[PDB]
Design a protein around this ligand. Structure first.
Ligand code: KTR
Length: 131
């Protein structure tokens, strides 16, 4: 049951990614965790991501077996991949600065989701909740 409206509750080391990856604050303001909306619209071998925020907006399509894209000179650029194994999804990114590796594993911890991301020395976790 991935396809649905997802609203992040709490986060851990999220700021960590903002520094090591150099993620802007203006965009991170609501994307940090407090006011971040992560939408899931699984479509075939690709999942649509609709992000909702106060004034800012974000979105990124996903495809099992394809690279991630988040190039933003205004904030940061991260390119990786995304794949799902059974009931678990493992996304990834890579910084253009020096091709830094970034890993993310989202598991279904019952009625909630426990996210764990890592990026060269920077590992950030994130507990999820639904609207
Ligand atoms: O959606 C983003 C984003 C990243 C860079 C620029 C613009 C948006 C995001 C925030 C936080 C995170 N992402 C991607 C997965 C997770 C992480 O990095 O670990």
């Amino acid at each position: 049951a991935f396809d649905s409206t997802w609203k992040v509750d709490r986060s851990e080391n999220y700021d960590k990614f903002m520094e090591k990856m150099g993620v802007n604050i203006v965009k991170r303001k609501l994307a940090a965790h407090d006011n971040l909306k992560l939408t899931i619209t699984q479509e075939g071998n690709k999942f649509t991501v609709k992000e909702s925020s106060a004034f800012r907006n974000i979105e990124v399509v996903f495809e099992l077996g394809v690279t991630f894209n988040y190039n933003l000179a205004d904030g940061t650029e991260l390119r990786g991949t995304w794949s799902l194994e059974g009931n678990k999804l493992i996304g990834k990114f890579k910084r253009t600065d020096n091709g830094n590796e970034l890993n993310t594993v989202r598991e279904i911890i019952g009625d909630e989701l426990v996210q764990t991301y890592v990026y060269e020395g920077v590992e950030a976790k994130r507990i999820f909740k639904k609207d």
